[PDB]
Ligand SMILES: Cc1ncc(COP(=O)(O)O)c(/C=N/[C@H]2C[C@@H](C(=O)O)C[C@H]2C(=C(F)F)C(F)(F)F)c1O
Ligand SMILES: Cc1ncc(COP(=O)(O)O)c(/C=N/[C@H]2C[C@@H](C(=O)O)C[C@H]2C(=C(F)F)C(F)(F)F)c1O
Ligand SMILES: O=C(O)CNC(CO)(CO)CO
């Protein structure tokens with residue numbers, strides 16, 4: 006069963022909601038992936054930063070295999086013995102009172118919106134159903150009707166309305182706009198990514214996150230930080246907001262929370278917010294199941310025990326330093342923090358980010374474009390400096406082969 | 408670490424969005440669960456019908472263990488070698504052109520709403536953003552802002568607005584109301600459960616589903632059948648709609664699609680609907696990952712090879728027959744199809760569905776109430792007639808001990 010067979014068969018029987026890069030992967034471990042013909046590749050996408058810990062990390066695998074022989078799902082109608090241990094661990098690890106477990110990133114975001122609105126009505130005293138949540142243009146937090154309603158990307162929302170009311174949108178990295186938006190006492194929260202991933206790794210100016218926290222406190226507005234892709238060592242800290250010593254009111258985690266072995270996500274906040282939701286008022290069939298909790302506990306331990314945040318910090322400097330050695334004729338910008346990085350391609354009609362990624366694949370490195378001029382470079386955080394330097398050679402050899 | 412310790416620790420560190428039955432489960436297999444003190448129980452909830460195949464079915468476990476050592480997540484940016492095999496299998500199994508894989512039940516529902524609206528705008532010709540979707544009162548399809556906006560249950564939606572526009576609600580099991588609702592040419596779809604699970608196992612009159620299909624065809628409206636809990640042999644057929652030989656335009660699957668080992672869900676429909684969504688316009692980080700696909704393929708094979716639908720059919724008759732032998736003084740109604748069943752309790756102030764389930768737990772059987780007068784009985788479909796008869800004894804011994 007060849008790569009071409011694999012492409013054709015997905016095309017026949019599967020929805021066309023994606024156009025993947027033409028590579029048919031069968032196997033992966035650490036920083037490497039192998040296709041069906043056995044060719045070996047560096048993974049510079051990390052499955053959108055879900056395999057921070059490397060593919061099939063043995064510690065997380067063994068947690069999965071130990072638990073799958075015991076108990077995988079009771080539903081939340083009864084207690085299991087794993088969920089709390091995970092809850093005690095993750096809430097102490099991040100220093101919040103409580104966690105609400107969900108499965109996917111967008112589910113954690115919907116949860117955060119529901120906490121914000123409920124807190125707005127039952128604590129802040131907003132009249133029912135006047136609550137607003139402010140978002141930054143360029144945000145991406147998933148594909149539900151609610152998530153695309155806050156998007157400014159036409160490919161997310163066009164053809165899918167009517168849209169959820171009560172969302173306001175302001176420019177990203179703009180504190181005067183946030184100050185103007187928070188004049189409305191019916192605003193309950195501001196939700197924002199510490200670095201906008203899908204918008205093309207857009208890093209806000211130093212002090213932005215400190216100013217956000219100040220404005221939210223001053224106006225009695227919840228600061229929701231979406232760390233589903235910036236968190237868990239990807240940017241060189243436990244949370245990207247740690248760079249400015251800022252404590253959000255709600256933190257969203259996902260992707261790397263499981264090492265890529267299970268959809269696990271989390272909403273962290275204190276009691277005065279979390280307990281606004283009463284029993285029966287929110288949940289999920291698979292949220293908090295024992296199998297995902299065991300996996301999450303191990304995937305957090307791997308991040309801590311192997312010191313991947315400081316590894317991501319020190320190697321990201323190296324990565325960005327080498328990438329700017331590329332000629333400004335061809336690479337117009339280098340952006341990133343820790344091991345979440347991007348380069349912008351001077352998109353002539355000679356060439357584009359898609360053709361670059363095709364040739365990168367030919368030379369053994371997997372990455373993928375985000376707007377035809379942007380290419381993300383985000384390898385697993387278990388990569389070593391010598392392995393990283395080999396990868397930079399493949400990027401050099403590719404960019405300069407045009 | 409005792410059951411009481413387990414309760415207290417979840418209470419301290421976890422959100423209070425649930426009030427589970429006081430039982431702390433550590434282990435499960437087949438139809439049985441064991442708590443931390445070793446006591447053994449019949450599972451008559453099946454984790455809300457996600458473990459149709461029994462807890463930790465060895466065939467599904469071995470599929471998980473084989474794949475977790477190989478590759479668990481590439482993201483949809485590249486191809487993996489498993490996804491298509493699953494897509495070919497499930498689309499031929501249910502006789503639709505295509506499948507769109509997602510993770511949770513509510514994600515499949517949001518997907519169905521987005522397909523319906525997109526089809527309404529790009530095929531039916533509804534002006535943008537006038538599309539409507541009709542739902543039946545009592546529906547439950549999840550906890551996103553969109554899903555609670557169609558709910559008529561105040562505990563789902565109260566305090567969580569403002570709500571998604573464009574949803575109409577009609578009585579369930581009411582064909583004249585549907586005919587009245589579909590007079591609006593801007594309606595794109597009607598979404599409905601063949602049996603309303605969360606509303607208390609509410610079974611519509613014979614012919615209802617045939618009348619729905621006729622009205623939807625006559626008015627050029629998509630018939631979306633939510634089988635996330637009625638499907639996959641739970642009611643005695645592959646799809647609950649199979650009882651009336653009705654083919655919906657969109658079918659939603661979830662829960663049992665994985666055997667309870669992984670959150671896997673699916674949206675099935677033909678090309679003229681499915682291909683309204685173009686690349687980049689919908690997706691999910693974990694949807695379609697190789698690990699969940701291997702698990703789903705095995706969990707479907709277990710349903711087919713062990714003939715659980717006919718087993719569920721023949722044992723559900725037995726179950727409902729015995730349950731009506733209970734005195735009408737105390738059990739006001741018995742409802743269900745296949746192995747999805749409920750009894751209604753004459754809720755005096757002497758006693759209620761919660762106290763019944765407490766005493767059922769004391770006598771070794773796990774079930775749980777849904778509105779304080781309704782108790783669901785839904786054991787795994789691998790149960791045997793002799794095991795089922797033992798369980799009925801525990802239900803008899805409990806109801807008559809009051
Ligand atoms: C900050 C943030 N909050 C929530 C979610 C929802 O999480 P989810 O519901 O998917 O679990 C996401 C998900 N982002 C995805 C979805 C995935 C895909 O489209 O396949 C590609 C991906 C992505 C990343 F991560 F950067 C990119 F390409 F869009 F740019 C997210 O980035
Ligand atoms: C027909 C249908 N369509 C979609 C979904 C969403 O699927 P999901 O997003 O959860 O994967 C569901 C989920 N129903 C759940 C959620 C779970 C919980 O509240 O913990 C209890 C449960 C339930 C069942 F199954 F009957 C009950 F108690 F609400 F009555 C569903 O029934
Ligand atoms: O009307 C618009 O332009 C947009 N309105 C919303 C976003 O601001 C929904 O998309 C309001 O929630």
Ligand SMILES: O=C(O)CNC(CO)(CO)CO
Pocket residue numbers: 555556557570571572573574575576
């Ligand atoms: O206004 C209402 O009573 C309800 N409106 C909606 C449901 O019909 C949203 O909850 C419209 O989508």
